Amino acid sequence: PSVGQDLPPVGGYEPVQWRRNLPARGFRPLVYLAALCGICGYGFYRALGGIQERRELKREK
Amino acid sequence: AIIATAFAETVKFSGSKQELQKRTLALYRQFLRGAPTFADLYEVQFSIPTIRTKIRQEFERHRFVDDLSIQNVLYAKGHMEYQECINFWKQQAQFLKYFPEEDDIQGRHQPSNFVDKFLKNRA
Amino acid sequence: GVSQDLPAGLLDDIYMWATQFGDRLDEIEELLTDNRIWKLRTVNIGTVTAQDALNLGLSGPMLRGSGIPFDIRKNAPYDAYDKVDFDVPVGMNGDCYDRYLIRMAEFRQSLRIIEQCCNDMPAGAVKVEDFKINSPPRNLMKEDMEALIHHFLLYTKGYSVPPGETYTAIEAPKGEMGVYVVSDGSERPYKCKIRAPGFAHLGAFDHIARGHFLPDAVAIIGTMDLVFGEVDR
Amino acid sequence: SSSLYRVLRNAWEVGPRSYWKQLNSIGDTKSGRLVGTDIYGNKFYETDHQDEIHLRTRYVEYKEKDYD
Amino acid sequence: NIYAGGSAAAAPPAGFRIHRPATWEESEEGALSKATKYFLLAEMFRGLYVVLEQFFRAPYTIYYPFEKGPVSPRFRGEHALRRYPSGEERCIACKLCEAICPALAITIDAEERIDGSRRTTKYDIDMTKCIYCGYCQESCPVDAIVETPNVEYATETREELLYNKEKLLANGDKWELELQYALDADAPYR
Amino acid sequence: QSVLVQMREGTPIGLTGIYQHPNPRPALIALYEATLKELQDKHPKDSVYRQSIENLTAHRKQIVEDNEVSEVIENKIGAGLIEEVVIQAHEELELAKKMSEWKPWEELEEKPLEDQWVYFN
Amino acid sequence: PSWENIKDIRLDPKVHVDEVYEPIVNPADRYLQHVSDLHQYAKYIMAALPKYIQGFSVWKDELTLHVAPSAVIPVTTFLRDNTSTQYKSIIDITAVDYPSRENRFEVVYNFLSVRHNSRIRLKTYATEVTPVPSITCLYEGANWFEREAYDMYGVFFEGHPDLRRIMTDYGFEGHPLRKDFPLTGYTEVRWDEEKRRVVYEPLELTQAFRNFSAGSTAWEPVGPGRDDRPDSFKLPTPK
Amino acid sequence: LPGGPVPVFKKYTVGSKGIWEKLRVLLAIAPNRSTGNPIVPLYRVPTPGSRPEANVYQDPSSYPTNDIAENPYWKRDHRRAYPQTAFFDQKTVTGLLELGSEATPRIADGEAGTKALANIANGGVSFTQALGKSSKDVIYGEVLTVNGLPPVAPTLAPKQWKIIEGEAAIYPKGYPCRTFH
Amino acid sequence: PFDLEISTLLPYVMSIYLVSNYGFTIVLLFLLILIIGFVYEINTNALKINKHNKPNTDSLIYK
């Protein structure tokens, strides 16, 4: 006889996760490069516009 | 362990006594050249000729050994002790195992006769 | 056998741990496996050819780093590992990176063992049947004259082993660890000897670590897994 | 958890004098329910609250400035 | 069939041959797509975002003199010589704790006392060579010495760490309410 | 002539340090024929060693002579991959060359003592 | 789909047997067919090298070849090189002293063919001063093992680069795992205040070692036991 | 595929609640990841010193061994039924090659057969002479295998490997570690 | 010699408006004369330390 022991459930446990859970996340790399070139080029727009404005200010002074 | 340590020798057993005599001769030469290195290396208090006379005395211990096989194990142990001493693996506290009586006088009341041994029942 | 029975509610607990550990180890895998720094620091470091891994006496994750499919719990199984289903990871290049990738998957296979043994645990006795090699329960030895005699003798004197010699080797996570014991026939072993797995690994250090740089003499220590209770004793 | 709202609401529940005493005592702010007192004199508390990690539930408030 | 000799049914498995490693030209990724991951450090940023997620979660630390960690009743700490109900020393000097102790910490002298009962004159444990195996507790038939779950008794001298009969009877005095809780949950499993 | 037994650089293979060996079977059958010829010339025909390695390499050489492709002969041989098999046939060739110097079919030169080989009954 | 609405494991029907049934069987019975195969293999190995193999013993799927010391190197090469054997990996090699024998130490070699999944043992002998030759020219991994078997046992390995002590003190005089060497040893260590170094002194204990081997059984505790020898490899009774 | 990703409500971890769960499904790499902390009412309640199962516990045993009356212990001891080391000299193998075996005895005239045994027992013939005198059928029956090949180094339970290649593998294609089953 | 260029580019960056269209081309030519010495350096692999951990290139030719 064996009373008072720990035993598994009669239906068993549910299955655990032992596979690798590494899902690929992010946009495509061409999306990040296109976004990079867009952010950069808009920055160059504002920067070179400000340089020309500062040149006209230097003319006035 | 392809390559061996610097001052190593592959252990090899000689069937003639005169080859063993040549090897112990070469080994005394190797200890005796390396005694200034030992005095520098272990930062000892005394002079180099005391190391050299310790080396002579430790060969004076085993001079009248007859058995070639026992001479062979004795040679191999001596070369291992040389390889430990020259490579600085032994430290100064185990280098000075070799000099127990020089470093300090242990005290008064050295028992020599039966009576002084008896009064302390050999301590 | 075993010292004593499990506590009353541990089997429902090892499951609750396993369910979250499966995710807690995916996360450690993220910043090492596809780190370019951790990759570059461990790519052709510690390369062991498969014919040199045998002459050096290397085993476990270092022999299975180098291509050879051998592990004791599948090849010569013991302690109910035959009844439990799992797979084995074995690298292909002898580097420190395939010794790394096979450790990362033996976590997975071990969690698979824990689940399959939580589900399939039977009932019954936990120590061996007889009281001439391990002690009676304290319920019984306070009632039984025979069992009090056996209890009082297994601790003053001990049990006696038949005269013989054995080398029994299992697979520690460090690699193959065995013990060679010579039994007198008395109740003390005439001779014991552990074969430390890391002893042969540290003994194979200068065969591998020639020609590497000084930083790469340290990431090779971490793969041969030197805990040093093994190597000297 | 490590939020500011938890330390704020426990500071409100425990009260400012016992807040200052628990702050000189521990770094945390804890609200318990007085399970009992010691023969040496050490009040013990147990925590109901939902946002408590495992092994955080029970604690001692000592009596002496020098505690063991 | 029949195998050669040097030959079992451990042939190579079906598929033990590797495939040749792919050249650069037989790859599905473009050069621009691959090198965007190269110069924009993609998986480095992924591993960065992992530990940024870990910044915003609950720590594990418990505060030690105010909150203690886990205890099972089987746990072992310092030693204690228990007493019977109505106060009797329980140690019948059977020397079984001495005979089993794997590090030879126990030393006992035993004499028949005035009652004619068998008791220990001297009981002693060296706690500097005790290894906490619990064989001394497993071996005693009267269950006279036990392991209390106290680990907080660290000292400043060695002399204090040598426990005679009197220190252990005072421990088995002090912890008896607690050892009740331990042996109510352990004694079926022993 | 000279023969190759193990590539130490080339197309990779499942084992580390081994690589793919070009033309395994002519090297294999020539290494076999060298084992057969030296073993027939230098060992006595009574001896059990000569008998079994002659039979063994005759069996292996028959399997190598029969089937045309690599993946089927390495299933019928029973050893590892054929690169590994060529290493083995090389190794038993060198063994059969050493045994003629050591001459082990002789009766044993160092008999043990009676006190030697006792183990507590 | 919440963590408060998760089911608990602790209340559910758990499996309950009234009574467990475990048949009883000798664990030596499962070996017997392989032990017979091991017998036939070892008889072949003795017939192949009759000059070098003095005996063998099969215990229970454990094979041991019994070989002279001047016969170490020719047997080991065979165990490496023959395709039927292929005992590539050295596992562990060590010594055991029987002080009652004239040749005091015996030196055991364990091998593992990872091809055939087989183990093998090779036992030779050596006295305190006479050697046994080293197999470290064959095996790159053996030499540390050989050298370990040096320091504990004093057994020599002729033809060994870097033979010296390992895993003992550097100035240590003696060979520890040896029956004449006492347990606690000869010396002890303290910090002398005067010389400002550690000093090595003769031994002295604050508690003496009490062995409890004095007081073992006076009844022969195990019998002779049965045998696993197959009917093919024991001598026929006449008629 | 049986051990694949399961969502985080089957994982016994303190997780999140309310609008902060909707926040962290957005700001995450994989949404089915626990936070590591065990649930306080579930994990280790009741504590091991206070269990209702310890009151009812009783020592386990199997039936043909806890039996009160049918077994005697000598039938079911196996420590005393240990087998011995089969130690074979060189001369007892000459006996097995020339006398024979108990399975196939090549001995007639047993009263003279004891004397035929006795000179080998004293060292009459040699082992190389025993191999040379032995017939080809004896050499190929008991020293060698029946085909004439050397006996393979025996293993107890042979293992046949099977490499798992597809989506059931532990690492996908491109990683230098393979699963071998 | 790379540091001395970076401090030689420092006079230009302050006068970049004055030398419009002309000092631009001179600084281009200056930087290009530097870049070809730099590609000499990267083609020789001067700063790279080799490893003498060669995996035994030479195969096993026998007899």
Ligand SMILES: CCCCCCCCCCCC(=O)OC[C@H](COP(=O)(O)OCC[N+](C)(C)C)OC(=O)CCCCCCCCCCC
């Ligand atoms: C506080 C402001 C922080 C701003 C973040 C820093 C600069 C931006 C870096 C670009 C990374 C990125 O956001 O990429 C977006 C991708 C998710 O897209 P996907 O699921 O893989 O589908 C793409 C399928 N395609 C390819 C077919 C189109 O990655 C992630 O969200 C992972 C979590 C990073 C969260 C960073 C916080 C911003 C909230 C975004 C919630 C969606």
Ligand SMILES: CCCCCCCCCCCC(=O)OC[C@H](COP(=O)(O)OCC[N+](C)(C)C)OC(=O)CCCCCCCCCCC
């Ligand atoms: C290799 C580089 C190729 C560049 C090709 C881009 C052509 C795009 C056409 C838009 C021009 C425009 O319309 O923007 C003109 C702007 C704003 O000037 P404004 O003040 O509004 O003009 C008023 C005229 N006044 C002053 C006489 C009154 O000026 C610029 O400089 C911004 C140009 C866009 C930035 C391009 C940078 C490209 C990235 C280079 C990364 C190193």
Ligand code: SF4
């Ligand atoms: S404590 Fe127990 S084992 Fe020790 S002497 Fe007392 S009764 Fe015996």
Ligand code: SF4
């Ligand atoms: S716990 Fe172990 S070492 Fe300590 S006294 Fe008990 S038996 Fe001895």
